[PDB]
Design a protein around this ligand. Structure first.
Ligand SMILES: CCC[C@H](NC(=O)CCC(=O)O)C(=O)O
Ligand SMILES: CCC[C@H](NC(=O)CCC(=O)O)C(=O)O
Ligand SMILES: CCC[C@H](NC(=O)CCC(=O)O)C(=O)O
Lengths: 332, 332, 332
């Protein structure tokens, strides 16, 4: 059974088919690719865009989405095997996945890491559990990667440059400030999709500590090697933004500090200047700027940049809807 | 772009068209005025009637409603401008409104005041923010006014008297008891719609402190002046109910006590007799009684009154469904 | 007006019609028995299966389900009569039921007991209040009985044995361990449906204290007397499982300990061996095993049993969907 866990599991031709079909849905939003069909959207963390775009996407295609929130309405779910379940979890993912399998045609899941031990978070236990026990296709709605955002971001870029071939473009994935440490998911996904598109990627971040998990650095290299692009890690703002075509900001907690965020506080606080403002954007090749959102103004990016005509954040958010309808349609 | 923020922004002819179309939907509930269309219902406070009537109204018209609750599922939203967003709000209404604008065709919003400073609450920051940044029509689901209730209430009255012309009817908007201070919204809306219908309106309330904000007292005067009705403030129960045709109860916190409810407690507690019971209703001209609901029995009104055949509360609640389908249909 | 509060209120012919229609829906899931229709699903407790199966069932039949959760989104609801509502409940079920009555065509309700006083819980105040004030058919989504589970369980059994006639089968309803005391609902329902099907029922439980409320023991006797089956209470594991055809596990708090669970703790803890493992299942006549779910692994049943080909828990969960579509279709 084919799932949509990461874009890395898909061939360039399959992904390309997805984007084109997404572009097709954007011109003809109503359809019947999901008539009488339904999808279970399971959320273990908040969401505005993902929840809304999927719920609407399923409706516009003749289907119906059932939104579940383990712990708020549905029963909390246990993921570990061979365990005496006398704790806070009343049922196991093995049952939950098989049960949903008899009701819905697709299962979407959102589960951010717990931030206590990256060794445990990097395993993607939730997504992998669903994909293992579910008799129906599973869709990643963001765990430690955000593949749906990738395709929304990618489509938005091609649309901006009026071409599907983004090779030779200078892509800058910059870390940005935030009072607290966040998920690396969106970053791992951006690095993955930008290198898969074959762009000249620079991972701008404060210190080596902030470099993404090796897994994605490796996926990125394999992508560069295959698409003819390039990868590069920079700790210098100006040399990074210089002549950039795209600038994607996202804040995240330094991996080496999982479970020990105390000393991480004083470190991130001394890099607030990483904020994406006009100065840095002026150094770009009239480049574009985006963010997966939700975005904090005057923290991650200044008001002037968000309101700038060069900001394609709203278009990227919109394509989430089209891109996901292409995925669901392709999975049923 | 035309919105439905308050009935005061609409002409008498437009409002009349709304009520008639609502009466038309009441005879033919299923339609296609919203086929393939959707609406984002954003709730910052609880709701049973509004949430249900809108969700159903959108369905019965071929559309789909997406219910969002900032803080429970969607991300909390910031409304102030030029602020360093390092607080509890992860994203700004400027983005949220533009994003929803790419997904849904209509946006409904519910946001009661915070009760700390009426000077800030009376500004209607949430509703105005949505209407400012949203590329699609916005609908007031209750903030400091409850226009949807107004039209449901109005339709219910015309239906009761078998006529659209309510002029010359004695309308009594009475304050009523409640262990705590509430929103003036429903009251401000009742005063507005009753004076706009050209009835003889009396605002019965305990003391001058309980008189509604000048804004609505002024809207009411302009309405009297235009419809030929009348406005009047009374602190005497019997002289108010006397020969009334309609009696609308609603409890609210004295505006001058926002942020300082301590001394408000002892004041409201000495006016529990304002409860709408049989005695007061007997003094009426066999008048009708209603309440926007949720209503607390034996506090706001006695069981005998609620169960009375003169109580049209349930019909008013029902018309919410028809009246809102007329608004959505008119806005797309 | 006909409701679906308990299977006991329905004749054997009506119930049989329900199961057959459920079997019919299972072959033809999409229909129009609910076109333009809607149902209000009111939840006072968590739910994954019930909420999902009903929401989907309504969709697959052309209708729409509105999920309400008094206290989370909708306003909390008061059920006592002639009370001064100055507490935590803003509105009364008399209004809530009549209001929903003007919006939806059906009302489903879930409300577990409070576990403080069984004398009050056994009254089924919530379900009875809805059925009393609602102008439209009411459906029990589990209170002190779980009739929907009954029919899902029953259908799953007939399907397993390839016949609708379950008479002469040895049915074992066994209590099982759980760190805390639970609702007897599923148990009361199993005892009811198994005796109504005319099987040889044994209620295996630790001590006499754990025997179900007399009401259901009585319903069971009347059912035995009518169907030709049998009822029997056993406190011995091996004599119970011996040659069983069906084994239904469910944990519950000893009724005589409501409001006084302290001493109940040490009592249930000394019966953990009641867990449904392979040994006990080996003593059966190659019997089947099920559980209403959510089920805690290695507490209520071992992993080996849940994963066993003899476990029909997932099928029972699926039939919830078909069985409820048959009920809704029959009630409109
Ligand atoms: C379908 C059964 C629903 C419910 N189950 C629970 O409340 C179990 C909760 C837990 O095990 O923590 C019950 O006991 O009736
Ligand atoms: C689409 C991104 C979702 C999520 N964002 C957050 O958790 C931000 C929360 C905050 O800023 O308070 C993340 O970091 O991946
Ligand atoms: C339709 C009216 C909604 C709201 N009502 C409440 O907040 C009442 C809450 C309570 O009585 O506890 C209000 O006062 O405007």
């Amino acid at each position: 059974l084919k799932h949509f866990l990461n874009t890395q599991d898909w061939s360039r031709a399959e992904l390309d088919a997805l984007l084109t079909q997404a572009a097709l849905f954007k011109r003809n939003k109503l359809g019947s690719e999901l008539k009488g069909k339904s999808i279970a959207l399971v959320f273990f963390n908040p969401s505005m865009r993902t929840r809304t775009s999927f719920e609407l996407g399923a409706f516009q295609l003749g289907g119906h989405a059932v939104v579940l929130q383990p712990g708020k309405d549905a029963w909390p779910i246990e993921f570990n095997l061979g365990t005496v379940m006398d704790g806070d979890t009343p049922e196991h993912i093995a049952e939950v996945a098989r049960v949903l399998g008899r009701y819905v045609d697709l299962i979407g899941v959102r589960a951010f890491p717990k931030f206590v031990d990256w060794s445990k978070d990097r395993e993607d236990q939730v997504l992998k559990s669903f994909a293992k026990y579910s008799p129906v296709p599973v869709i990643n709605m963001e765990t430690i990667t955000h593949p749906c955002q990738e395709l929304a971001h990618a489509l938005a870029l091609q649309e901006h440059f009026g071409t599907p071939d983004l090779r030779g473009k200078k892509y800058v994935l910059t870390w940005t400030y935030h009072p607290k440490p966040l998920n690396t998911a969106v970053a791992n996904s951006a690095l993955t999709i930008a290198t898969r598109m074959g762009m000249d990627v620079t991972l701008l971040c404060p210190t080596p500590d902030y470099i993404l998990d090796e897994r994605y650095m490796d996926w990125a290299a394999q992508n560069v090697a295959e698409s003819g692009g390039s990868l590069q890690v920079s700790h210098d703002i100006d040399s990074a933004y210089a002549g950039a075509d795209v600038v994607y900001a996202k804040s995240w907690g330094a991996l080496p500090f999982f479970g020990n965020w105390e000393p991480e506080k004083p470190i991130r606080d001394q890099y607030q200047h990483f904020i994406v403002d006009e100065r840095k954007m002026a150094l770009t090749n009239n480049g574009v700027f985006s963010h997966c959102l939700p975005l904090r103004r005057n923290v991650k990016a200044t008001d002037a940049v968000m309101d700038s005509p060069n900001c394609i954040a709203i278009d990227e958010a919109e394509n989430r809807l089209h891109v996901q309808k292409a995925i669901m349609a392709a999975l049923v």
